[PDB]
Amino acid sequence: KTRKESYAIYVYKVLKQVHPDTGISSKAMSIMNSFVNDVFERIAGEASRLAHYNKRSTITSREIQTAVRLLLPGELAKHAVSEGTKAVTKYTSAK
Amino acid sequence: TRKESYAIYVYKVLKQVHPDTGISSKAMSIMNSFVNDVFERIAGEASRLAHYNKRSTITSREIQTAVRLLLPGELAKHAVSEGTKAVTKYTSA
Amino acid sequence: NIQGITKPAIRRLARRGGVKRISGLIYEETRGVLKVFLENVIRDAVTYTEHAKRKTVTAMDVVYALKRQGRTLYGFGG
Amino acid sequence: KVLRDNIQGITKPAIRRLARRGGVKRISGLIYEETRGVLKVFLENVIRDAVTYTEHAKRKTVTAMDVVYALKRQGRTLYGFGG
Amino acid sequence: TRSSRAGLQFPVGRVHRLLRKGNYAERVGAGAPVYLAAVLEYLTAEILELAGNAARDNKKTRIIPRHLQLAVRNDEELNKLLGRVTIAQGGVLPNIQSVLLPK
Amino acid sequence: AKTRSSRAGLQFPVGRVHRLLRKGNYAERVGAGAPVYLAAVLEYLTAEILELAGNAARDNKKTRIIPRHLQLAVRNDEELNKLLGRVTIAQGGVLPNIQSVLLPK
Amino acid sequence: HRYRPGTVALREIRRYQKSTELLIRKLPFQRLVREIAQDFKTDLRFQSSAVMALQEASEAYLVALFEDTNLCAIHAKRVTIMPKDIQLARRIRGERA
Amino acid sequence: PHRYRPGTVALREIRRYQKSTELLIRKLPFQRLVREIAQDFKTDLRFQSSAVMALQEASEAYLVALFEDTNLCAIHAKRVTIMPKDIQLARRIRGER
DNA sequence: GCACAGGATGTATATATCTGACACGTGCCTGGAGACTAGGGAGTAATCCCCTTGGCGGTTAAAACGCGGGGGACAGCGCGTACGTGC
DNA sequence: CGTACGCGCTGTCCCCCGCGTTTTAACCGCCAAGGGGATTACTCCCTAGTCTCCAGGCACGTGTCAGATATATACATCCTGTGC
Ligand SMILES: [Cl-]
Ligand SMILES: [Cl-]
């Protein structure tokens, strides 16, 4: 019985991080999963062209970054770059 | 340095089609754009089709159905025929 | 078949649409409109099925079609 | 040297000329400012993006290509300048 | 993991796989699955935020598609982002044009 | 013949279309008929367009295709016009069309 | 008694914008879908989710459309939507020619 | 003396500008404008003269497309004169913001 | 009350001329051709079971249909003025 | 500077909305059957990768004619004038 993946459990964990005493329906869960994949493509895609445009073979956090700045509206971009630059530095801390 | 272009192939085809007729620098440029645009549009949508079907390779079956999504009717139909023709031609030779 | 899209159904959609008053000729117009819509979406959909070598049009073919057409839909396996 | 009020370069006879190629013949006086309004939101969009490409390419010069890529991005693809 | 090592809830592994396999480029940096998983995590938070709010406002403990729609269409910045997305079972915001109202 | 173009009896460089599809991250691997097919479809269209442009050039008594000629070509053809329904041609201009109600009686 | 022409209209608008349930009953719609697809390919099957997907996409679209239609009506100092509005809406959307 | 009636030169001018392709906004003003807006996003930027020319090509196209659809809105309203509100309806419907 | 010459208004058009861009020929190099291997994708065939279709009959809401009159569409008119034209 | 259009008013006629009752088929629940899609193991064709080999395609340079420019002239019409 095939082992189909999703983002479901992580959506949940983040839900708890923001609204601890709140739950979700399957129907809305699909929407959250759709949302994630759509956003993932759009950012990944932009990043991809960015590389090409600049005759370079690698999609780095930087490519991802500027992708985000083209894909997102002023404020939402702003925070996104934060969380982005943060988790990266915090990652490069640990090893 | 080398700036590649479809400038020769476009000339060739123009001469085949309107032999007493030349193209301006800008016109060429435009043409040159059009080829590249339709290239990506096709190539991209083929790429999605490979992906959607858990498939590692873009074969002319992809490039074909890509074409059937991208182009409008008469354009699509002719282009398809035109295409699968040169493949057939290509296999044999 | 098409006329299966009932006047009252079309009326409800226009209500959710914010519309107060509806001309008679609208209903039929709506139908051509809806038809064109499905056609294009189902044409693209089927093309995906034809290419997937299946006799069963999936949700994902639909979903891929709507994307193609810039009418992305969430909740059927984005 | 400092740059100020340049949108008023978009003179009224030009905003006119465009409207004519646009098939309009009768132009209300409150149109000319709305057009500048619009042209601005328009240029602010293409250049925000053009620039983001220029910044990514780590450059101080904005190229025909950064522009063209931006337009493509905004679904206003343009032929004639590379790409 | 690496979700840990970056304080993320979102699968930093999963993401690195998907970038490599989804044909975006020849090679794929170490920071990017992290940068992106984060941005993905960030944005799913903002939605879950305002939807939950909306479910409180609409007096329910569980979020249904509507609560997402309300959260989205009412947010000026999110609505743009999902400017071309129809959300299943979203409905519409209530909006009735003036001149349609009684006198 | 050596040129894969000739094997396919095509004007377009099938070697180029082949390199591009690989240096382009569309998939791991590329078939060998896909370049051919694509290189041909590219040709059909440049031909299909150049045809109508030349005619446009002709009516305007001209030896040389300038973008107005491409523009006239494109927006006069229902179908080409839709393929390029979101596209701008530098120096195109627009189609002469004046609305009824603006014409004197 | 009798409610003044247009007052249940306003009341209905309120009711439908508050709800998210689908407004075309499934089976006529479903039959319309199969008909249209048959014209593209014979002996075909649909996933029930594939039909819902279409249904959602279509309604959502039509509602959006009435919204924009309705604005054109209003632009013409009118209060009744008419086919000439839809044509203008779609024209400007760049759907229709 | 002599005096063309109102609307007579408009129709003429339309036909003039619909035959040609040459840019309608003046070249220099245009550039000053673009350099401004860009400065206010990042200082110390230069431009390929062709890159300005691109943005202008793209600009006029848009506005002419715009006026086209504005014009339709004027006509929708049994009017012949275009008005900010017309433009405004076109942009709402185009789904611009 | 209207229409057609009177006139000068702009566009059309004919001309030659002066220019610079295209179109070509030459030669130099890089990207494709050629030939070979080794490896894994995909195609094919062989089994499975899940999902789709189908057909049937009960209440039950929804579709239908008509009736009657109200208010909105639309057409006519007139006023006031803004926007086109010209210098 | 004034003309002809935006719009505000009116006035009529009918096309929609409301509402009560009469007519259809949407829906739900229940079971039944086989199509097709999903999963698995196998072999072989096809494509990536690699090397050596050379003309297709590029830049570079140069010669000329299509087209832009300048100015003269023929063709079209629109509105103002004058008279019956
Ligand atoms: Cl990285
Ligand atoms: Cl192939």
Cα–Cα distance measured from residue B72 to residue F78, given in angstroms and rounded to the nearest whole number: 9
CATH classification number, E1-86, choose in 1.10.10.10, 3.90.79.10, 1.10.3720.10, 1.10.20.10: 1.10.20.10
Map residue F65 onto helix, strand or coil. Answer: strand
Residues of chain C contacting A33 with CB distance shorter than 8 Å? 77-78
| Interval between CA E50 and ligand 1 midpoint (Å) | 32
Nearest residue in chain D measured CA to CA from A42:
D73
Answer whether F104's CB lies under 8 Å from H28's CB: no
| D62 DSSP β-pair partners | H47
Q: How many helices (H) and strands (E) does chain C have?
A: 3, 3
**Proximal ligand: closest to the CA of B63:** 2
Cα–Cα distance measured from residue G51 to residue D7, given in angstroms and rounded to the nearest whole number: 51
Domain coverage including residue H34: 1-97
**Proximal ligand: closest to the CA of E31:** 1
Using a CB–CB cutoff of 8 Å, tell me whether A53 touches chain D: yes
Tokens (6 digits) for C22: 């509806």
Residues 6+ away with beta carbon under 8 Å from A58: A51, E25, E26, E27, E28, E29
Cα–Cα distance measured from residue A37 to residue F97, given in angstroms and rounded to the nearest whole number: 45
Q: Which chains touch C (3 or more CB pairs under 8 A)?
A: A, B, E, G
F63 touches strand J (CB under 7 A): yes
Cα–Cα distance measured from residue D29 to residue F35, given in angstroms and rounded to the nearest whole number: 56
Using a CB–CB cutoff of 8 Å, tell me whether A41 touches chain C: no
Map residue A47 onto helix, strand or coil. Answer: helix
Answer whether H67's CB lies under 8 Å from D19's CB: yes
Residue C76: count of CB within 10 angstroms of its CB: 23
CATH of residue G11:
1.10.20.10
Cα–Cα distance measured from residue G36 to residue A63, given in angstroms and rounded to the nearest whole number: 44
- CB nearest H48 (choices: D24, D63, D80): D63
A48 with F25: Cβ contact below 8 A: yes
Domain coverage including residue B83: 1-93
Answer whether A26's CB lies under 8 Å from D42's CB: no
F90 touches strand J (CB under 7 A): no
Separation between the CA of B54 and the C1’ of J39 (whole angstroms): 15
Domain coordinates in residue numbering, chain E: 1-86
Q: Which one-letter DSSP state was computed for residue D83?
A: -
CATH classification number, D1-81, choose in 3.90.550.10, 3.30.9.60, 1.10.20.10, 3.40.50.11030: 1.10.20.10
Answer whether E28's CB lies under 8 Å from A59's CB: yes
Distance set, CA G65 to CA B8, C11, G69, H65 (Å)? 47, 13, 6, 21
Q: Which one-letter DSSP state was computed for residue C5?
A: S
Separation between the CA of C55 and the C1’ of J34 (whole angstroms): 15
Q: E39, exposed or middle or buried, with CB in 10 Å at 0-12, 13-18, 19+?
A: buried
Tokens 């193209």 appear where? B23
| H17 DSSP β-pair partners | none
Tokens (6 digits) for D37: 């309004």
Tokens 């078939």 appear where? F31
Give the number of beta-carbon pairs within 8 Å between B and C: 19
**Proximal ligand: closest to the CA of F14:** 2
Mapping DSSP onto H, E and C, the string for chain G reads: CCCCCCHHHHHHHHHHHCCCCCCCCHHHHHHHHHHHHHCCCCCCEECHHHHHHHHHHHHHHHHHHHHHHHHHHHHCCCCEECHHHHHHHHHHHCCCC
Cα–Cα distance measured from residue B58 to residue B47, given in angstroms and rounded to the nearest whole number: 7
Tokens (6 digits) for E44: 């799913």
3-state helix, strand, coil in chain B (%, to 5): 75, 5, 20
Backbone angles phi, psi at E61, to 5 degrees: -85, -25
Closest CA to D20 of F93, F32, C58, C42: F93
Q: Which amino acid is at D39?
A: L
Radius of gyration of chain D (CA): 16
Q: How far is CA F3 from the centre of its chain?
A: 23
Using a CB–CB cutoff of 8 Å, tell me whether G96 touches chain H: no
| D39 DSSP β-pair partners | none
Answer whether G81's CB lies under 8 Å from G87's CB: no
Answer whether D21's CB lies under 8 Å from H23's CB: no
Cα–Cα distance measured from residue F44 to residue F49, given in angstroms and rounded to the nearest whole number: 9
Tokens 């996003």 appear where? H41
Cα–Cα distance measured from residue H29 to residue F29, given in angstroms and rounded to the nearest whole number: 51
Tokens 């309009």 appear where? D24
Tokens (6 digits) for D53: 């490409």
Q: B1, exposed or middle or buried, with CB in 10 Å at 0-12, 13-18, 19+?
A: exposed
| H52 DSSP β-pair partners | none
Map residue D28 onto helix, strand or coil. Answer: coil
B74 touches strand J (CB under 7 A): no
Alpha helices for chain A (secondary structure H): 8-18, 26-53, 61-71, 74-93
Residues 6+ away with beta carbon under 8 Å from B66: B42, B43, B45, B46, B49
Q: How far is CA D50 from the centre of its chain?
A: 11
Tokens 């042209």 appear where? D39
Tokens 């053009």 appear where? D50
CATH match of C1-76 with 1.10.20.10: yes
Answer whether C78's CB lies under 8 Å from A34's CB: yes
Q: Which one-letter DSSP state was computed for residue F88?
A: E
Answer whether F36's CB lies under 8 Å from B86's CB: yes
Distance set, CA H19 to CA D23, D24, F69 (Å)? 12, 15, 12
Answer whether H70's CB lies under 8 Å from D24's CB: yes
Cα–Cα distance measured from residue D62 to residue D54, given in angstroms and rounded to the nearest whole number: 6
Cα–Cα distance measured from residue A22 to residue A32, given in angstroms and rounded to the nearest whole number: 15
- CB nearest A70 (choices: D52, D57, D65): D52
| F30 DSSP β-pair partners | B58
Answer whether E75's CB lies under 8 Å from E50's CB: yes
Tokens 């206003």 appear where? D76
Pairing of strands E27-28, A58-59: parallel
CA atoms within 13 A on the CB side of G3: 7
Residues 6+ away with beta carbon under 8 Å from B42: B63, B66, B67, B70, F38, F41
Task: Calculate the CA dihedral of residues H42, H43, H48, H49 and round it to 10 degrees.
Answer: 110
Residues 6+ away with beta carbon under 8 Å from B68: B76, B80, C47
Pairing of strands F29-30, B57-58: parallel
Alpha helices for D1-83 (secondary structure H): 12-21, 31-56, 64-73
What kind and span of H or E run contains E87? strand E85-87
Cα–Cα distance measured from residue G76 to residue D11, given in angstroms and rounded to the nearest whole number: 31
Distance set, CA D12 to CA B66, D8, D15 (Å)? 47, 9, 5
C55 touches strand J (CB under 7 A): yes
| Interval between CA E30 and ligand 1 midpoint (Å) | 4
Tokens 């519409």 appear where? E92
Q: How far is CA B42 from the centre of its chain?
A: 8
E90 with G60: Cβ contact below 8 A: yes
Closest CA to A61 of A47, A79, A73: A47
Q: Obtained via which technique?
A: X-ray
H18 with F96: Cβ contact below 8 A: yes
CA atoms within 13 A on the CB side of H74: 26
Residue D72: count of CB within 10 angstroms of its CB: 18
- The whole-angstrom distance between E93's CA and the closest CA on chain A is 17
CATH of residue B47:
1.10.20.10
| D78 DSSP β-pair partners | F88
CATH match of F3-88 with 3.40.50.720: no
What is the tally of structural domains in chain H?
1
What kind and span of H or E run contains E62? strand E62-63
Answer whether G54's CB lies under 8 Å from G33's CB: yes
- Determine the nucleotide nearest to G31 by Cα–C1' distance: J26
Closest CA to E92 of G70, B52, F94: G70
Answer whether A38's CB lies under 8 Å from D17's CB: no
What kind and span of H or E run contains D62? strand D61-62
Map residue B3 onto helix, strand or coil. Answer: coil
What kind and span of H or E run contains H47? strand H46-47
Cβ under 8 Å to G: C residues 7-66: 9, 12-23, 25-26, 29-30, 33-35, 37-39, 41-43, 45-46, 49-50, 55-59, 61-63, 66
Using a CB–CB cutoff of 8 Å, tell me whether E7 touches chain G: no
Residues 6+ away with beta carbon under 8 Å from G84: H76
The interaxial angle of helices G83-93 and C24-51, nearest 10 deg, is 40
- CB nearest E84 (choices: C17, C72, C76): C72
| Interval between CA E20 and ligand 1 midpoint (Å) | 13
Cα–Cα distance measured from residue G34 to residue G56, given in angstroms and rounded to the nearest whole number: 16
What is the tally of structural domains in chain A?
1
Answer whether C57's CB lies under 8 Å from G73's CB: no
Answer whether F53's CB lies under 8 Å from F69's CB: yes
Q: Is the dihedral of CA D25, D31, D33, D39 positive or negative?
A: negative
Tokens (6 digits) for F57: 């050039």
Closest CA to B34 of F44, F3, C66, G26: F44
Q: Which amino acid is at G32?
A: L
Residues of chain C contacting A34 with CB distance shorter than 8 Å? 73-78
